[PDB]
Amino acid sequence: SSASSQEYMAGMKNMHEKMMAAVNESNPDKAFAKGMIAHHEGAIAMAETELKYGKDPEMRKLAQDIIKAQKGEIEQMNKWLDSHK
């Protein structure tokens, strides 16, 4: 019960850590890439927690979709960073 809230909270504080290190970036394109990647990783964590503790099928469906999509956009921003600035 409260175990779900902590797992949610753990993924959040995890995302906050990396997102903090990405906004001190000066180049706003690099800041968007690094920040949204950490932000997207937060979605995946929050979605995986829902798959563990969630009971509602519609939301568990959305969580599965969110994991698939965010992972995709993440690999794009990663490739964008390996080539740019």
Question: Binding to Cu ion (CB under 5 A): which residues in 26-65?
Answer: 39-40, 43
Token pair 């698939």 in the structure block, residue: 68
CA distances, 63 to each of 6, 31, 41, 57 (Å): 18, 26, 13, 10
Reduced to 3 states, what is the DSSP secondary structure of residue 53? helix
Contact between 9 and Cu ion (CB under 5 A)? no
Interface residues toward a copy of itself, by CB under 8 A: 1-2, 4-5, 8-9, 12, 16, 19-20, 23-26, 28-29, 31-33, 35-36, 39-40, 42-43, 46-47, 49-50, 53-56, 58-60, 62-63, 66, 69, 73, 76-77, 80, 84
| Residue type at position 48 | E
